[PDB]
Amino acid sequence: KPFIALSNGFIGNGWRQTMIAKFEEAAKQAQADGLIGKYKVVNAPGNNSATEQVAQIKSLLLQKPDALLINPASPTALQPVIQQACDAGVKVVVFDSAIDAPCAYILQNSFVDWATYAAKPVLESIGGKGNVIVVRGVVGSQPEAEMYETTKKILAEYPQVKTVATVTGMCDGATAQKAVLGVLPSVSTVDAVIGCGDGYGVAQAFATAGKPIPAVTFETNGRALSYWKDNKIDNGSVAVMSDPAQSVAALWAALDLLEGRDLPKQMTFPIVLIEEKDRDTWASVLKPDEYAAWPWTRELFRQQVEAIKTGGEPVQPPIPST
Numbered sequence: 001k002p003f004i005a006l007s008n009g010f011i012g013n014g015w016r017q018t019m020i021a022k023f024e025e026a027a028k029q030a031q032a033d034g035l036i037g038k039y040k041v042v043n044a045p046g047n048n049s050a051t052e053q054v055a056q057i058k059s060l061l062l063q064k065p066d067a068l069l070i071n072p073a074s075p076t077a078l079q080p081v082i083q084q085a086c087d088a089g090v091k092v093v094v095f096d097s098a099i100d101a102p103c104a105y106i107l108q109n110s111f112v113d114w115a116t117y118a119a120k121p122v123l124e125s126i127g128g129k130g131n132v133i134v135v136r137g138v139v140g141s142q143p144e145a146e147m148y149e150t151t152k153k154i155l156a157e158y159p160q161v162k163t164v165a166t167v168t169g170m171c172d173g174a175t176a177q178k179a180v181l182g183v184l185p186s187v188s189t190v191d192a193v194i195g196c197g198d199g200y201g202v203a204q205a206f207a208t209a210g211k212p213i214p215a216v217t218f219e220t221n222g223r224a225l226s227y228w229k230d231n232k233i234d235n236g237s238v239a240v241m242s243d244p245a246q247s248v249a250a251l252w253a254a255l256d257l258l259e260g261r262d263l264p265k266q267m268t269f270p271i272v273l274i275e276e277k278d279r280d281t282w283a284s285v286l287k288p289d290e291y292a293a294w295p296w297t298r299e300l301f302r303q304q305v306e307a308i309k310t311g312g313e314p315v316q317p318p319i320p321s322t
């Protein structure tokens with residue numbers, strides 16, 4: 001039975017921890033079901049560092065995986081080892097990123113849509129004027145770079161909005177908290193903070209400074225959703241992120257690849273946008289540290305692939321009630 005290896009370029013935020021947890025739960029079940037024989041997760045430590053991930057992938061290849069799932073630390077640094085994996089007969093699914101690795105299959109989300117849903121409604125909620133802080137995501141990664149360009153583009157459409165600081169948050173609340181706290185004493189009143197699923201941490205910085213909580217971009221986790229409700233935050237705050245369960249979809253892709261099935265080289269799967277009407281539904285199911293994730297079954301995966309191939313309607317997976 002196949003050996004599925006997963007190499008993850010950054011583990012220092014809760015989204016990535018949910019992404020691993022969902023993969024490991026799905027893999028464990030696949031193993032019990034006799035669909036796979038073995039699975040392994042390896043995380044590169046540090047602030048999204050490609051050099052150690054490349055080394056880790058080479059150590060994984062020595063164990064002869066049948067498929068390798070990769071969340072890449074860099075848009076470019078993994079290309080040679082990806083080709084090395086393919087040359088050794090390994091099926092390679094790059095997920096939660098789009099990179100120019102010709103032998104790999106790409107399974108991503110629309111980072112552009114995410115960045116737009118995080119920035120545009122937030123700027124509208126402050127009347128297209130005022131002061132904002134930009135908190136960047138997983139700097140060094142391809143999705144972060146794409147989203148930052150998108151955020152700047154949207155900001156350019158609102159001339160009366162001033163960026164009073166840019167910092168790096170790594171889509172991690174505590175990291176964002178620390179970086180924002182660092183600049184608050186030096187800046188004018190802040191109307192919004194456009195970040196990467198870090199709004200709970202951003203909010204704590206403002207609370208520590210005794211300043212009113214701006215419009216923020218929350219984590220799609222249980223704790224942020226509850227904070228949003230319990231303080232009845234009604235100030236333009238939003239909750240949108242990519243799907244951590246891209247890892248589970250990548251598992252199903254790998255297994256289909258391993259039995260000779262054809263997949264598109266590029267696949268766009270859906271992000272997780274939590275509009276007001278969906279908050280309580282998600283909050284009912286998510287543990288505090290658990291990020292919202294689509295429950296991909298092998299069948300739901302195949303449906304989405306069929307929609308992609310045929311250009312049909314994106315599958316809108318169901319919010320789990322359990």
Ligand SMILES: O=C(O)[C@H](O)[C@@H](O)CO
Nearest residue numbers: 015096137138143171242
């Ligand atoms: O760590 C994260 O939040 C994710 O990888 C995003 O940067 C891309 O979906």
